[PDB]
Design a binder for this molecule. Sequence first.
Ligand SMILES: Nc1nc2c(ncn2[C@@H]2O[C@H](COP(=O)(O)OP(=O)(O)OP(=O)(O)O)[C@@H](O)[C@H]2O)c(=O)[nH]1
Ligand SMILES: Nc1nc2c(ncn2[C@@H]2O[C@H](COP(=O)(O)OP(=O)(O)OP(=O)(O)O)[C@@H](O)[C@H]2O)c(=O)[nH]1
Ligand SMILES: [Ca+2]
Ligand SMILES: [Ca+2]
Ligand SMILES: [Ca+2]
Ligand SMILES: [Mg+2]
Ligand SMILES: [Mg+2]
Ligand SMILES: [Mg+2]
Lengths: 439, 426, 69
Amino acid sequence: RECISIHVGQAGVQIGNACWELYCLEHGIQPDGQMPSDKTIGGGDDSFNTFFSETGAGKHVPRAVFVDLEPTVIDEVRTGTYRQLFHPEQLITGKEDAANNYARGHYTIGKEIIDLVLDRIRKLADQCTGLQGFLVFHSFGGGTGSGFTSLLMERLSVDYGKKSKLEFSIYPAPQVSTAVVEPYNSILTTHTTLEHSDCAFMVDNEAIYDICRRNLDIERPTYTNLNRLISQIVSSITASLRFDGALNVDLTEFQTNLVPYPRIHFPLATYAPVISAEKAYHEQLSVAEITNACFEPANQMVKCDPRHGKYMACCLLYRGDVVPKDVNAAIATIKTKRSIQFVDWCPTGFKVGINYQPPTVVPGGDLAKVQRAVCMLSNTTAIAEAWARLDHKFDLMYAKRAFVHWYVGEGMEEGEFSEAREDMAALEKDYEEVGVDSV
Amino acid sequence: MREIVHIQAGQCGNQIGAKFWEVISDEHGIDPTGSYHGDSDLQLERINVYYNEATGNKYVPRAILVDLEPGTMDSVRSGPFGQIFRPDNFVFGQSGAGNNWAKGHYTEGAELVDSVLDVVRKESESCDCLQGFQLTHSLGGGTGSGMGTLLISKIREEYPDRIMNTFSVMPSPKVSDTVVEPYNATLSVHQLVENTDETYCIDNEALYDICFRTLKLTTPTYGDLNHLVSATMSGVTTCLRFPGQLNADLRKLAVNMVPFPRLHFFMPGFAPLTSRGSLTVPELTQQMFDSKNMMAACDPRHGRYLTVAAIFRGRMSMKEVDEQMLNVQNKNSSYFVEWIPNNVKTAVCDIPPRGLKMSATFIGNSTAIQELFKRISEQFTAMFRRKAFLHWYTGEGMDEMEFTEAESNMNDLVSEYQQYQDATAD
Amino acid sequence: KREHEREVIQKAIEENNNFIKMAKEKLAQKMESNKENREAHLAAMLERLQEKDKHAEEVRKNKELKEEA
Ligand SMILES: Nc1nc2c(ncn2[C@@H]2O[C@H](COP(=O)(O)OP(=O)(O)OP(=O)(O)O)[C@@H](O)[C@H]2O)c(=O)[nH]1
Ligand SMILES: Nc1nc2c(ncn2[C@@H]2O[C@H](COP(=O)(O)OP(=O)(O)OP(=O)(O)O)[C@@H](O)[C@H]2O)c(=O)[nH]1
Ligand SMILES: [Ca+2]
Ligand SMILES: [Ca+2]
Ligand SMILES: [Ca+2]
Ligand SMILES: [Mg+2]
Ligand SMILES: [Mg+2]
Ligand SMILES: [Mg+2]
């Protein structure tokens, strides 16, 4: 029961760098891949083996692939503290990036390297007794993150069919955006990928940026700060696959309980508690307190107001000092609050899980080591607010065909821009249809 | 990895271009012998963008020096860094163009262009991944203007998927008395509209006014004017030479700065500009967006900004920069097109320029740039209506229609800038 | 019922297979249409500069024919 992570572009690679660093600390894997606590050498059916393969020498190798169309970012990995952890074939780099151009990442530069990426992925898959699916980390805005990811997703649908594909996407934010055409790249990748991904977790950089300032007193956050925080959400989601437990979810479970309709598969994550060490000092937070924090809009990962929408499904993943009795009471209270509205076609609307391994913080980080934490994955109609903001920015530029020549110069037709935008128009409509009360 | 090939044509290109290499070589710790005498390791992270590496850990500029008057070549060799340039990359002519565009584009430049492209080819083949070319030249002379645009077309012909960037210097009556300068410029603009992805407009009328009005130099010299350009050129290329992720290469810059292929004429700016006989982040920000700090003789408040790139240099509070860029954008909302969201991008480099602690360079694609082209069309049509000095060009084979097409095409470009200046969101 | 059970698993297989083929087909024409476009966007861009050489030689020809003092 195994998962392969694919990290694409600067954002995906740099996010993976934080996630795999956290995985090693959670499992006690050293930067050279050795895990002393593991006594089954060269193999095993342990829970952590879903994400780590093993060699006869006792090394624990991530079941991951790093791909970028320029080597600047992945070279850090090849020389960083965790360079020994990855086999050289796992890290794949071109020589010329996509220049914030979806078309270059999909057609011009992407096709140069797609076949090699699939071959290295296939070698990882052949090392599997049973493969659940793929975890794809990328950014909506970059040329490689959008253009190449869409090509990879389409190719994966062919080589592996209906096998699960889950995305971790980075929604553009002007605070740190390095491209004016990011709206074009996001609408195009979303449309191209929309029918290939079974579930996509979006993260709005602006939301993370505000959370880091407010909750962690970080006066001017950097990608390092943001990426560690994303890692906690990714760690919590994968915790049920990497750690052995009786109250876990797996890819198939929480997919089946979060996605009511194929196109409506964009939940927004919420994590709690996000606290600095100063405030954590002499302050321990209860299961109910962190459970209530998940429904406060301030702690969301996409700028939106769930109060102005309706919940269709909530997945609450607790980890740490959490007892079933506390969890049941917390969710019981939520079901009494009327500020939290569920659609009328979802009476049972809570998937629940508990893992007993406590959260881990990387040394030198800003998050405090807490005893219990919770991640909530909620599919609410409020997420459509995010699509509306990005579609409006798409419209403003496309009305004047601004920047479109860069895409036509790389082979695309104006039809793909309207075709993609009409798909987003339908999706915006689908999100209001599902929010209407039944007859 | 990401290599740029520099080219400089004419006296103007060679003098502004020679200063470019003196300035950036100092910034990277390269002395005229090509040796590295620097302290911090960020000086070499991206040294290969503009410098080839040779045995002995000597760095040689990836530069090609060109002119149709051989005397120029000696001037560069004698200069402060004249011995750093690779000697085979000198490509000299015989006589000189005499400020005749047709000779540099068709007759004497054509006979020399193939020798230049050979040096171009040799330099490009030693690049791990070539990203593009940058040309320094003037539009009023005869060699940089005529042969420069020809070299652009021939390079685009042989490297059509690489970016072509130029630093084009624009004639002014205030700086040179030559009478046919309006002809040469209008003819080169007609070329640069089609064959370059992005062009930094350097206007001597703006450089002279800055040297006279702001720096109080009653008799500015090309050394004074070229001190301004070198500061600008160093600023508008620092994203390309130092670690960062905003407009880090020439294509990423073009994609953020060029909403429409013809509208690729930028309005450079620099701050501070203080006399030797006389600074905070809010001040830097206000000064950049002041018309008196623009290297093009246009007022941005007479038009609208399609896209803007601001580069800050020095040790400073990034939080302070974020606020001030936000402040100036929404305090001047009316001067930014509403139909291009988030069209102002800000980069910060820890390393400041020489002599200063905090610098700010401004790259603006403004519809106000049309004021410059309207100045030239006025001068151009003033003489073309009477066909003055037109025999200089027809004598080399040109027809009168190439002048009308160049005139009409420049007038179309001005009309296009106005179309988007008056455009609405709804 | 056993007949129904076989009809169901077979449908699932036919579901997956069609997903692959609509995917494989949609990708193939979209990379081919794109090929045509970028080929033609270059084919005509360099036929643009044969007219600029047929005109470069035309100019140089009109000079030598003007040198007939
Ligand atoms: N959270 C987070 N977002 C990032 C990071 N790096 C880039 N981004 C975002 O990604 C978008 C730009 O895409 P990139 O990942 O930088 O570009 P790319 O994927 O390498 O593709 P190319 O531009 O063609 O090289 C912007 O919206 C950034 O805000 C990161 O390290 N962390
Ligand atoms: N700022 C500045 N402008 C210059 C300089 N040299 C020439 N110019 C300008 O360039 C124009 C004349 O072009 P030149 O470079 O002298 O001519 P050329 O390109 O060498 O071509 P020919 O001399 O005709 O062979 C005029 O408009 C001058 O104002 C310079 O060193 N600095
Ligand atoms: Ca084992
Ligand atoms: Ca082992
Ligand atoms: Ca002078
Ligand atoms: Mg990149
Ligand atoms: Mg279970
Ligand atoms: Mg000269």
